[PDB]
């Protein structure tokens, strides 16, 4: 999708993530594990819920609707009363088919963006202590135990504390 | 006996969606009659397993 995060540079999706929509699976000395990143997950949900409600605020409460079926063959006037309606319906449908399309295209592109946004936000936070593996996994270059890891997940990770360790693991 | 704003000749229908396809004849504050019988608006991300 526009950004290449989902359906692309992130191989496929994690079917075992039920807490939320965006996440962190890891591996270190203290085994492996997963955790869902909420500040993101809401972010998307917000936008959808939001356009959902934009999309539905209308019900054509418009006046006397003419007769639309007809019992007898009449001519000019009956003919115009069908043409008018026929034409109305054809547009309303064109509108209708285009809305779903643009919206849906957007919804995808939007959820893509948020993935990428997470992945950037994280890499920045990791200033000079890991390298992008390529597949949307990192290589943290020190000994980061389950304590430390969560710091990175919920923002509190101070890079300087490690750097020394990781600079040396990278270029020695 | 039942509440329902929107009448068709086929019976009542609800107006919670924006588009109906039940009958172009319609009394009350009814979703607009479109030709398609289904239009799905996506509310999640792309699925990939």
């Amino acid at each position, epitope marked *: 999708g526009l950004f290449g995060a989902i359906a692309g540079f992130i191989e496929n999706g994690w079917e075992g993530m039920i807490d939320g929509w965006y996440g962190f699976r890891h591996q270190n000395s203290e085994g492996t594990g997963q955790a869902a990143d909420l500040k993101s997950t809401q972010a998307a949900i917000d936008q*959808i819920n939001g356009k959902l409600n934009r999309v539905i605020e209308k019900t054509n409460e418009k006046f006397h609707q003419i007769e639309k079926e007809f019992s007898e063959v009449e001519g000019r006037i009956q003919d115009l009363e069908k043409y008018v309606e026929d034409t109305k319906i054809d547009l309303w449908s064109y509108n209708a088919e285009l809305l779903v399309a643009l919206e849906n295209q957007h919804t995808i592109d939007l959820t893509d963006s948020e993935m990428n946004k997470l992945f950037e936000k994280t890499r920045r936070q990791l200033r000079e202590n890991a390298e992008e593996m390529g597949n949307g996994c990192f290589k943290i270059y020190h000994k980061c135990d389950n304590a430390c890891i969560e710091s990175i997940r919920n923002g509190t990770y101070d890079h300087d504390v490690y750097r020394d360790e990781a600079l040396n693991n990278r270029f020695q | 006996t039942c509440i329902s704003e929107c009448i068709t000749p086929n019976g009542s229908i609800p107006n919670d969606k924006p588009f109906q396809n039940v009958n172009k004849i319609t009394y009350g504050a009814c979703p607009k009659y479109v030709k398609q019988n289904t239009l799905k608006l996506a509310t999640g991300m792309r699925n990939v397993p």
Partner: antibody
Amino acid sequence: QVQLVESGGGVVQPGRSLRLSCAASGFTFSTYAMHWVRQAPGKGLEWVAVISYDANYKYYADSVKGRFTISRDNSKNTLYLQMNSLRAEDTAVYYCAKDSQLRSLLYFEWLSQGYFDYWGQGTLVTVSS
Amino acid sequence: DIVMTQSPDSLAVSLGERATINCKSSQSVTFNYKNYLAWYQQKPGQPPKLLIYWASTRESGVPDRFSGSGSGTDFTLTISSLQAEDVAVYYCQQHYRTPPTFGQGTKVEIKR
């Protein structure tokens, strides 16, 4: 305008059931979430349940987990709350409250609710033998 | 559970002077430039009426002397001059993560 009106509490022995009802009027009930929030006697506010407009996401506060069941009837415009296996700790006045957020998407246990927009009459539930 | 701590507990000020209350959160309840905190008045034998939402907007009915303020993790309700139809408990609430939680409550009486 808006108006919520609660129903059917009172005395109820421990271990036995009861069910409350909030009868909403003056707004588009079906497009809003609803909550139950209780209040111990001369104490404070606890949150008890939420049920989305869908009727298909519902979460309960831990104290009343799996004894209580929050139920909703968007045709008859009224919110229910089944109270099975009650006990002392549950004595409180019980209030329905309207969510502020329109067609909320409670896809998850933690997602953010809206503020509590209008509240009901209140209804007393006593739990003693 | 996010712990909402209110302070002080009881208050009291001379009918027509200023009164002021604090809600302290277990963590940021701010998110995309909205502060998901609300404030409720509750007089006795009655439910609560909504005083303020999104940290600092007055609900339509409320008069202009009530004011929410704050952002992130400390908030402060303010009655600019306490008229006598204010004596109630005052409850702050967060709705940024389910379970919504409330403050303990600040009873405000009249100083005399």
